[PDB]
Every structure is written in C-alpha cells, then in structure tokens.
Amino acid sequence: GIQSYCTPPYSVLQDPPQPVVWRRYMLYDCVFDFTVVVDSLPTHQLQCYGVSPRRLASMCYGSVTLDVMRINETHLNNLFNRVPDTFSLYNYALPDNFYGCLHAFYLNSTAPYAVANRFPIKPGGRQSNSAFIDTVINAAHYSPFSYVYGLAVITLKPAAGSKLVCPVA
Ligand SMILES: *[C@@H]1O[C@H](CO)[C@@H](O[C@@H]2O[C@H](CO)[C@@H](O)[C@H](O)[C@H]2NC(C)=O)[C@H](O)[C@H]1NC(C)=O
Numbered sequence: 001g002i003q004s005y006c007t008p009p010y011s012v013l014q015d016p017p018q019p020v021v022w023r024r025y026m027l028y029d030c031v032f033d034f035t036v037v038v039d040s041l042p043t044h045q046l047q048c049y050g051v052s053p054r055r056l057a058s059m060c061y062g063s064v065t066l067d068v069m070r071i072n073e074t075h076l077n078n079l080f081n082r083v084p085d086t087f088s089l090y091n092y093a094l095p096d097n098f099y100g101c102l103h104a105f106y107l108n109s110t111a112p113y114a115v116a117n118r119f120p121i122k123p124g125g126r127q128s129n130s131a132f133i134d135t136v137i138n139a140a141h142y143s144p145f146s147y148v149y150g151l152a153v154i155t156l157k158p159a160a161g162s163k164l165v166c167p168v169a
Helices: 010-015 073-081 086-089 130-142
Strands: 023-027 030-031 043-049 063-071 100-111 146-157 165-167
Touching: 030 130, 043 073, 063 073, 063 100, 073 086, 073 100
Parallel strands: 030 165
Antiparallel strands: 023 063, 043 100, 063 146, 100 146
16 A cells, blocks of 8 residues: 655764664664665665665665664774674674675764673664663773764564555656
8 A cells, every 4th residue: 555654864874873773773664764874875785685776775674674873994894804893892892694785984973882782782773771871872981982983773674564664867
C-alpha cells in the first residue's frame, strides 16, 4: 500500500553523540531520503561492504539501521581496518558479517571526546551502566580533546517481500 516517510535524524547529524552513548535509528516499512545521510554530508570517508556506494541509495531494502556518533582518526582507521582498540572494545562495534556502509564526514570540531576504555561490550552492543557512562563523559573533560569526525553506520537488510525501505527521487 501507501507507505509513510521515515524522518531523517538531522539533529543528531549536526551534533553526533559521544561514542560511549552512540544513537540508533531504525527504518522499516517506509520511504527514506538517503541523501541526508550520504550525499548532503561533507564526506571524509565512505566505505561499503556488500554493496557499492554508487548503488547504495538507489535501491530498496528489507530494513535500514542508522548508528550515529563521533570518532577520531585513529579509531576511524582501526574501524576500517578491523583492528581492535578502545573504541571497538568498549563503545561501538560492528556486527558479524556487516552488510552496509561506514560514512565518516567532517565536523570541523576538536572537542571533548568521551571514549570508554574499560568494561568490554559485545558486537552491536553498548555501555548500559549509567553511572559508568557518567564517569566516561566526565573524564572526557580532563583528558586531551580530539579532532573529530561524524560517523553514520548504515546497516542494510536485503529486500524480502513487501514492506521495504525505499529511497526518494
Ligand atoms: C583518538 O582518541 C584516543 C583516546 O580516546 C587517543 O588514544 C591515545 O593514543 C595514544 C597514541 O597516539 C596512546 O598512547 C594513548 O594511550 C591513547 N589513549 C587512550 C585513552 O586510548 C588517540 O591518540 C586519538 N587520536 C587522535 C588522532 O587524536
């Protein structure tokens, strides 16, 4: 039938959360403007797995997940090369057999960079203890600031019947 439009996360895109509190947005059974999280963004690095970047925003999917946070160059490079570090061990980790895209874009901002460096998370997981999270965010104030990129992790699910996420033209 006639699908609704998914609302793009403009607000979180103009101010990405600290990686310790990365945010997820789930897109399902809707029309979505992919340009907001791809073309319109000032791209620093776009890396895709299971799909080409030129094909990404042109087809439909079973579902689309957007994970948004900030990330500095070291952690970004380790993320791309799949090398373990504090970011992927304690803050945000790609799921097994990741199908989708990593989109890093310019924020032109060197700021407090709140990254957990203890208490391991599982892939696709997050820190859940609010007290500890608060200590990480607080500790960010008393540690070197980092020059930082925005990061949108786009997880794709293959189309399988009706109720899809389709791009706007
Ligand atoms: C990105 O931020 C991390 C901290 O979240 C920085 O990590 C430090 O990196 C140096 C080497 O450059 C290590 O000796 C330190 O032990 C690291 N500290 C922690 C707490 O992990 C990293 O340097 C930052 N990268 C940039 C380019 O600013």
